[PDB]
């Protein structure tokens, strides 16, 4: 069959590319060591590039490790420093938020006090990383779209653990730091406040989350479909469009009646991705604070479906019939 551009059939490696650099002079804080990996080269660039050791990045890395360690040692102290039990219960242990009977006041260390300390360091690391993205775009004389797209993720991140607990009157509304526990919190949050399916902003965020995956399957396949026309070089197609941009546009113009440009595709791509946590952040922020039961909110706003059938298994079958006896 025709060669699908999923895996490169041959890859070349030359001298390592350090960077472009300018009078902003990013070289001093840039690492001098790079590596090459052929396994990752079958699908992308094979060069493991050099970190830029900025102060926002270093602070984020140091404080992020502090949050990671604090949660880790509390987890290790959960099972009494038993490593085999710690590994076995790794997906189950967590650093639980403070008990609800403490409010915004600082709770004792064993009852969420270490959660606040870990959360504070996590907040510093996450914000510092965002400042790194903003500074890196500024030093590269590029757009701040990476920083703004990241800031959208910060919005839901801040709402989940900082903004909502502050104006909910208790630190207990924060998300536990656990693999399964934050899944338990995710389910319990929906159950406590009705049903987040019936939260319009949760539904809106789901619309953009499906759309984000939908677009990036559309965009990923369309570019790979026009990669025979140099469609992977999107930036040069923006400045001087070739048959790759035209065919990609006409594929979707002939399919769904309208298309995008090689640059306008990423504006569509950016916004649904950015809108996914923005809408979710709004929905969580006003969940409980404003609406304490989403299904009842749906009932009074007339978008909760009504079912006229019976709700019992005895109305459709019988216990003996189900067992086959």
């Amino acid at each position: 069959p025709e060669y699908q551009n999923i895996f490169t059939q041959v890859q070349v490696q030359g001298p390592a590319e350090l960077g472009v650099d300018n009078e902003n002079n990013l070289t001093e804080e840039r690492t001098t060591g790079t590596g090459f990996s052929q396994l990752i080269g079958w699908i992308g660039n094979a060069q493991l590039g050099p970190i830029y050791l900025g102060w926002f990045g270093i602070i984020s890395l140091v404080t992020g490790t502090l949050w990671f360690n604090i949660v880790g040692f509390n987890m290790l102290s959960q099972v009494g420093y038993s490593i085999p039990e710690f590994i076995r219960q790794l997906f189950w242990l967590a650093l639980e938020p403070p008990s609800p009977e403490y409010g915004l006041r600082m709770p004792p260390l064993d009852d969420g006090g270490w959660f606040i300390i870990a959360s504070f360091f996590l907040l510093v690391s996450v914000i510092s990383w965002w400042l790194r993205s903003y500074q890196l775009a500024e030093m590269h004389k590029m757009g701040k779209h990476v920083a703004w797209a990241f800031a959208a993720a910060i919005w839901l991140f801040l709402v989940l653990g900082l903004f909502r607990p502050i104006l909910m009157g208790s630190w207990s509304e924060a998300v536990p730091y656990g693999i399964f526990p934050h899944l338990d919190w995710t389910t319990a949050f929906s159950i406590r406040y009705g049903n987040l399916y019936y939260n319009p902003f949760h539904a809106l965020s789901i619309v953009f989350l499906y759309g984000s995956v939908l677009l990036f399957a559309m965009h990923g396949a369309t570019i790979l479909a026009v990669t025979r026309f140099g469609g992977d070089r999107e930036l040069e197609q923006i400045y001087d469009r070739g048959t790759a941009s035209e065919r990609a546009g006409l594929f979707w113009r002939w399919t769904m009646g309208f298309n995008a440009t090689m640059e306008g595709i990423h504006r569509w791509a950016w916004w649904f991705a950015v809108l996914t946590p923005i809408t979710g952040g709004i929905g969580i922020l006003l969940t409980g604070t404003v609406v304490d039961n989403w299904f009842l909110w749906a009932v009074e706003h007339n978008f909760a479906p009504d079912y006229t059938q019976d709700y019992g298994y005895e109305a459709y079958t019988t216990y003996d019939g189900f067992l086959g006896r």
Binding site: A149, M218, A225, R247, F251, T255
Partner: protein, 274 residues
């Protein structure tokens, strides 16, 4: 109408089963043999939905609910107002979706471009197919498909999700979700990269691929490249669609018990010193 460059690409040929009989454009849309069947199936399915809405008693888009038959009906056809209409719309939906994918094959064949998009859509079709015709057959009843309602099919997901006792512990759902979050994460970063390079601060030259390539090298220490991101992104989205198909096809006909109890293999191993 036509774009400023569309005239040349509008050439005859590149059809699968149709010929010059259906080889024409209606507005911007391209009609083919499968565009004829898409138009028939989509209109028939859409009209039957509103016909069912009329008999349901409400035309509210939120409250419209066409539901599959009872589980007592098994795999056989049900009365139209008792679930049979849902089966026909499902048949129309499968025909509309398959024809749409086959039409996209005709679009890309005429343009000389690859068949990546119809293949990528087929993965999303497979996710719908496994939800409405594959899972019901493995259970022996058409009543396990989701109802055709804006909010009714949200109740089905909620009920099916809790029908397996905290669906969050489903290992395939765990894999499927992290593909959904990564795809949106990848979409945001990739969309930001191109826009940032193409739209610098005022008075600054536009940035080429080298400037955007080194940004993540200075950001996360590795950049997958202009070509790499599109293929990894397509696989990230296709895996999300594929693993979503897996997480629901293994729910009923594979693991009838609760999903946390699936993790009992990890909790109960000989290596662990109980």
């Amino acid at each position: 109408a036509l774009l400023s460059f569309e005239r040349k690409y509008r050439v005859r040929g590149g059809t699968l089963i149709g010929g010059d009989l259906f080889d024409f454009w209606v507005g911007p849309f391209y009609v083919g043999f499968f565009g004829v069947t898409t138009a028939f199936f989509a209109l028939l399915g859409t009209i039957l939905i509103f016909w069912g809405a009329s008999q349901q008693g409400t035309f509210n888009p939120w409250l419209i609910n066409i539901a599959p038959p009872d589980l007592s009906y098994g795999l056989g056809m049900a009365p139209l107002m008792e679930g049979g209409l849902w089966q026909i719309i499902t048949i129309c939906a499968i025909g509309a979706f398959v024809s749409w994918a086959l039409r996209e094959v005709e679009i890309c064949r005429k343009l000389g471009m690859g068949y990546h998009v119809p293949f990528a859509f087929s993965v999303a079709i497979f996710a719908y197919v496994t939800l409405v015709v594959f899972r019901p057959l493995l259970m022996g009843a058409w009543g396990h498909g989701f109802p055709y309602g804006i909010w009714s099919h949200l109740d089905w997901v909620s009920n099916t999700g809790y029908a397996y006792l905290h669906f969050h512990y489903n290992p395939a759902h765990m894999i499927a979700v992290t593909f959904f979050f990564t795809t949106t994460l990848a979409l945001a970063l990739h969309g930001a990269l191109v826009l940032s390079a193409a739209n610098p601060p005022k008075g600054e030259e536009v940035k080429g691929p080298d400037n955007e390539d080194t940004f993540f090298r200075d950001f996360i220490g590795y950049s997958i490249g202009t070509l790499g991101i599109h293929r990894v992104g397509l696989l990230l989205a296709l895996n999300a669609g594929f693993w979503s198909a897996v997480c629901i096809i293994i729910s009923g006909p594979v693991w009838t018990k609760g999903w946390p109890e699936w993790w009992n293999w990890w909790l109960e191993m000989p290596i662990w010193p109980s």
